């Protein structure tokens, strides 16, 4: 049901990218592709390093 579902598109216009797993919400955005403001009220920032390149 669309009233219970939730889509999350991503393109050149939608840099944000939302998740809602069984627990807490989440939003991922790149570090070298015109990132957002990156408020970071707490110290929560997941430096998702590249598996092969080993870069943030």
């Amino acid at each position: 049901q669309w009233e219970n579902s939730f889509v999350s598109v991503y393109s050149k216009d939608n840099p944000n990218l939302l998740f809602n797993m069984c627990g807490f919400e989440c939003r991922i955005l790149p570090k070298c592709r015109t990132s957002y403001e990156e408020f970071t009220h707490k110290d929560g920032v997941w430096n998702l390093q590249n598996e092969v390149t080993k870069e943030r």
Partner: protein, 53 residues
């Protein structure tokens, strides 16, 4: 280095370098500072001296 015992481990012996490398195994700067081996050695020595200063 968050623990105050990091200075004690550094003053103990060279095993503190191994511990830092195990904790900091994914140091991208360690790969950036790895092309210059003398530079990496000087950086490690300066870090140990600043920690032990």
């Amino acid at each position: 280095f968050i623990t105050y015992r990091s200075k004690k481990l550094i003053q103990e012996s060279d095993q503190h370098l191994k511990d830092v490398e195990k904790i900091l195994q994914n140091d991208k700067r360690y790969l950036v500072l790895d092309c210059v081996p003398e530079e990496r050695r000087k950086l490690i020595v300066a870090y140990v001296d600043d920690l032990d200063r």
